Amino acid sequence: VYAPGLDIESSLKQLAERRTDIFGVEETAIGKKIKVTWDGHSGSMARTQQAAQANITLQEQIEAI
Amino acid sequence: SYQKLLKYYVLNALKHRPPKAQKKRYLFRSFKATKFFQSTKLDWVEVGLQVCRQGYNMLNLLIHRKNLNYLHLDYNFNLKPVKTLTTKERKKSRFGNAFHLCREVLRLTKLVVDSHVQYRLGNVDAFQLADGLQYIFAHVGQLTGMYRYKYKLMRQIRMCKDLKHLI
Amino acid sequence: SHFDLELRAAVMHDILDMMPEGIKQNKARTILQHLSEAWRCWKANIPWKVPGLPTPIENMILRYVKAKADWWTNTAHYNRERIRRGATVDKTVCKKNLGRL
Amino acid sequence: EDPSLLEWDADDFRIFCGDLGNEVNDDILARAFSRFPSFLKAKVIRDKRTGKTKGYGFVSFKDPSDYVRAMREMNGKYVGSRPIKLRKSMWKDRNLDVVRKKQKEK
Amino acid sequence: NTQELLDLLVKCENKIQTRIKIGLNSKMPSRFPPVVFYTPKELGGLGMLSMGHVLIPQSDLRWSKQTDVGITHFRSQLIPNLYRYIQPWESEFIDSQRVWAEYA
Amino acid sequence: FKEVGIEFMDLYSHLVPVYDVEPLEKITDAYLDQYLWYEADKRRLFPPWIKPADTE
Amino acid sequence: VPGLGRGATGFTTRSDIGPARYEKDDEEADAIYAALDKRMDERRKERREQREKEEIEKYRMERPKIQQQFSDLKRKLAEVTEEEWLSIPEVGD
Amino acid sequence: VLKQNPFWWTHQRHDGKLWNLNNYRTDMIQALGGVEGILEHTLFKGTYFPTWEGLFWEKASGFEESMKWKKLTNAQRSGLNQIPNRRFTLWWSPTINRANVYVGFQVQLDL
Amino acid sequence: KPLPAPLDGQRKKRGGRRYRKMKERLGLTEIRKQANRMSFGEIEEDAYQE
Amino acid sequence: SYMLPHLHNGWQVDQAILSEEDRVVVIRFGHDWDPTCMKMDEVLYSIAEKVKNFAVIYLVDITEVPDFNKMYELYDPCTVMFFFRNKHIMIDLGTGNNNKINWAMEDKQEMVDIIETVYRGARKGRGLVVSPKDYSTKYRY
């Protein structure tokens, strides 16, 4: 079905924060307010997988800190 | 030729507007202030060959980015395929206009520096060097072909033809 | 062009802002349907009065409908001026403009 | 007269399921159809010497009543990688073809 | 008598022809043959009426035919216009008066 | 009488109203129109300067 | 899981659309290049931003924003009570 | 009546038929180059009928009997309406599918 | 209500009886000759009268 | 507003694609505040309940979920893609590339036709289907 009321609020608040041409009576700027991804090539999963594992373990290191 | 030269002179004079108040920032002074650059005094022909090689390297670093090697770029910046291309491979090879514009600019630079190195070697004298340079600048339309990737350049080409007529 | 989508989003956000969290999980869709029904009633030239709707919300909806109606009239007139003066258009635009006119 | 039609026949009803994905459905038909009503026999016709699935398979059901619900609820149901088509089993063997030929002249 | 109307007519006819060609294929052709448009409906064509100056290329009129003897080649100009076949209003009126007096 | 349904033929220059009337009333109106025109022509209600005429 | 675990595979047309196929020194180099770009931009930034600000201010003076228009009705809407809030009918009638 | 009438000024019953175009049709055929010259461009000779005297078209017959009456979706109606365009294109293929008409890049149909 | 899922029919496999009335409602027979035909070659009637 | 459900990361997106088994999954990649996405999302909202039987719609924010940009070449304002049983289905719109839509159409009827054709073809077993209209020309006269 359609999204719940609180999800509608989540969407609307983000739209307001991103569009001050309509909402947000402070200032302007259309889209402005006021990371490794796989390239789809099979010969790159090992590098991409390690990067996510290498980043998360660093995130785990940050988590320990 | 006379009439059109006058036309563009008048157009520039009429459309002129006063410049704007900048803050006087200097690109090469900033580069020198940086640490990746250093100064030296070189012969112009040496610098020209240097720039030709560097431009070739830059352009060649842009085709093999996709790891899709079916296009070969020679040292005169004439880009041709290495084989017959499937339609899918033609679509992959398809490249934007800006790329070809830069390629043809570097081609013109190559032509000029090659003329200068010819004179320096001795294959031609100073008179033939000057004749070749004038021919290059009056026939950049025939030799290089930038009008296929930017049409406003037909203005430059026809103006250069008119200048040739006048001289 | 999409002033109507913009206005609808603005009014929905404003209404939802002041509504307590314990009721927005259910009444958002109903208030949107009320907005649509009010617009339909205006387009059809019939009286629209929901007896149970609180008067402040009714006032806000009336303002929304007024703004959308103004935009609707102006855009219909401008598009018809285009088409009549002579411009390239398509069957869907021509039919929608005919309905509005 | 293949000696392979004497395993399902307990006075049960055989549904012939065609349009099966060749790569799969060695026993996934049994896995799907075991939910109703209980353990049963569901074979897949995989020709020998090639290991390639010929397509159609057969499923044996205890009652005509359970078979009705099974057909109405699995006709076109996504099994494996293809939807399945269900029809009635023919088993037109000799003991029945002789009777058919006898009836023809009558 | 109206010079603007002739230009409008030919522009609109070209628009129709281009619409048909675009429907045929996404890329506009060069030197499309006019036989397809102007062949009569009952003969497989569109039977399009013309009020412009369409010159049929001499190449298009070549046609062959084979029989037991072998192959034989043959030929046969501009498309007719509607106005040459429509009768003027002035002649219409004068002939009407005359014919109806005769009938009386 | 009943209600007549109105739409608009779209000649891009201007819209032309088009009315759709109930069939029985259409029949009665058509008969009345024919009868009135015939009798008016018989009695020469409309002088010759009212156009268009049936003849030209 | 990145999104390759789906077993999917991308597609490419044109060898122009983005990518190509980042350590301490690369961070320093990127800081250097960002400083270079900002310093080059600094020429006319002040005048450009001032003109933009004045133009938007005048445009808003001449034609306000939608939520600005609806601020009054929103404020008054604040008044209504929770008892009315959950009693709102539905268009089904 | 919603339909626009081009002959809003005359009635066939009273004024008669004020024009005539049979001569125009015959002259159009002659100018296009005679029935045989016209037929050259089509695919008629590929059908291998002995002559063009006893032939007849079948308007709106299609591969589905044309299925003119049915409860098809809008897309299916669109396909049923594109069928005649397909027949026309096949009929005129010999003179539309040539290098003179369409420029470069030729491609062979598989098999 | 949503669009129904565009399944085709299982396919009228039994005929006559009810089904001839099912088509006699709306899809009854027709001329089947010289009403569906165009008669290629000549025009017979006047020229342009589509 | 956009009452349509939103996906917030790559795992959610791929789980959404793998959840459906007999309905076409439509995904709109783009920013909700871009006007092109505004119009396209309005059309999708209009047709969502009509096509609920055989399709499910989802919206994806490029910035929130960028991991698909490289593989799928998501760099236009708004793009629409179709999936069926984890298979990316292609449509021969006539635009030159069959992978996506990459423009905001305004007729809910043609959108419904496109989704229906994709469903028909994918269920039949195809990986590419032919649109019942050629969008090579805008058809404006």
**What secondary structure, in 3-state letters, does chain D show?**
CCCCCCCCCCCCEEEEEECCCCCCCCCHHHHHHCCCCCCCCEEEEECCCCCCEEEEEEEEECCHHHHHHHHHHHCCCEECCEECEEEECCCCCHHHHHHHHHHHHC
Q: Is residue J123 part of a domain?
A: yes
Regarding beta strands J87-91 and E70-74, do their DSSP bridges make them parallel or antiparallel, or are they unpaired? unpaired
Whether residues J4 and A3 touch (CB distance < 8 A) is answered with yes
Query: Phi/psi at E99 (nearest 5 deg)?
Result: -65, -35
| Per-residue exposure over D28-61, b if at least 16 CB sit within 10 Å of its own CB, e if not | bbbebbeeeeeebebbbeeeeeeeebebebbbbb
Sign of CA dihedral C71, C76, C78, C82: positive
Widest Cα–Cα separation across chain D: 47
Domain with J72, as residue range(s), is 2-136
The answer to whether A25 faces chain C, any CB pair under 8 Å, is: no
The rounded Cα E53 to chain-centroid distance in angstroms is 9
What CA–CA distance (Å, rounded) separates G74 from C59? 10
Query: Phi/psi at G30 (nearest 5 deg)?
Result: -65, -40
What CA–CA distance (Å, rounded) separates E96 from F12? 38
Whether residues C9 and A22 touch (CB distance < 8 A) is answered with yes
Angle at J24 between CA J21 and CA J25, to 5 degrees: 95
CB count within 10 Å of CB A17 equals 13
Angle at A43 between CA A37 and CA A44, to 5 degrees: 25
For chain E, the chains sharing at least 3 beta-carbon pairs closer than 8 angstroms are: H, I, J
DSSP string, G41-64: HTTTHHHHHHHHHHHHHHHHHHS-
Partners of residue A10 in chain J, C-beta under 8 Å = 6
DSSP string, J57-85: EEEE-TTTSGGGHHHHT--SSEEEEEEET
Q: Is residue J11 part of a domain?
A: yes
Judged by 3 or more CB pairs under 8 A, whether G touches C is yes
CA-closest candidate to residue C48, choices C38, C62, C35, C58? C38
Q: E63 near H10, Cβ under 8 Å?
A: no
The answer to whether F54 faces chain H, any CB pair under 8 Å, is: yes
What CA–CA distance (Å, rounded) separates C28 from C16? 7
Q: Is residue J30 part of a domain?
A: yes
What letter does residue B146 receive in the DSSP assignment?
G
DSSP string, H42-100: SSHHHHT-S-SSS---BTT--SSTT--SS---HHHHHHHHHHHHHHHHHHTHHHHSSTT
Number of domains in chain J: 1
What CA–CA distance (Å, rounded) separates H75 from J119? 13
Reported as type and span, the H/E element at residue I37 is none
Q: Is residue J70 part of a domain?
A: yes
CB count within 10 Å of CB B144 equals 20
What letter does residue E78 receive in the DSSP assignment?
B
DSSP string, C16-48: HHHS-HHHHHHHHHHHHHHHHHHHHHHHHT---
What CA–CA distance (Å, rounded) separates F12 from H6? 16
What CA–CA distance (Å, rounded) separates J17 from G1? 15
Give the bridge partners for F8, in sequence order. F17
CB count within 10 Å of CB H62 equals 15
What CA–CA distance (Å, rounded) separates F36 from F30? 10
Q: J100 near J80, Cβ under 8 Å?
A: yes
Q: I42 near H52, Cβ under 8 Å?
A: no
Q: J78 near J2, Cβ under 8 Å?
A: no
- Chain pair H-I, CB pairs under 8 angstroms: 36
Regarding beta strands D13-18 and J6-7, do their DSSP bridges make them parallel or antiparallel, or are they unpaired? unpaired
Q: Structure tokens of H48?
A: 């291998």
Q: Report the CATH number at residue J107.
A: 3.40.30.10
Q: Structure tokens of H47?
A: 């059908």
The answer to whether H81 faces chain J, any CB pair under 8 Å, is: no
What CA–CA distance (Å, rounded) separates C14 from G68? 11
- The amino acid occupying position H23 is N
Q: Is residue J141 part of a domain?
A: no
What CA–CA distance (Å, rounded) separates A49 from A44? 8
Residues 6+ apart with CB under 8 A from G17: J73, J75
In which residue are the tokens 């899918």 written? B88
Q: Is A2 helix (H, G, I), strand (E, B) or coil?
A: coil
What letter does residue H33 receive in the DSSP assignment?
T
CB count within 10 Å of CB H21 equals 18
What CA–CA distance (Å, rounded) separates J97 from J94? 7
Angle at H15 between CA H9 and CA H16, to 5 degrees: 115
What CA–CA distance (Å, rounded) separates B59 from B15? 37
CA-closest candidate to residue I40, choices H39, E39, H56? H56
Q: Is B16 helix (H, G, I), strand (E, B) or coil?
A: coil
CA-closest candidate to residue J22, choices J123, J127, J116, J128? J123
CB count within 10 Å of CB H28 equals 22
Give the 3-state DSSP-derived string for B52-86, with helices as H, strands as E and coil as C: HHHHHHHHHHHHHHHCCCCEEECCCCCEEECCCCC
Widest Cα–Cα separation across chain C: 54
Number of helical (H) and strand (E) elements in chain A, helices listed first: 2, 0
Whether residues B65 and G15 touch (CB distance < 8 A) is answered with yes
Q: G4 near A48, Cβ under 8 Å?
A: yes
**Long-range pairs of F15-20 with CB within 8 A, sequence gap ≥ 24:** F15/C98, F15/C101, F18/H1, F18/H2
Q: Is residue J128 part of a domain?
A: yes
Partners of residue I36 in chain H, C-beta under 8 Å = 58-61
Regarding beta strands J6-7 and J55-60, do their DSSP bridges make them parallel or antiparallel, or are they unpaired? parallel
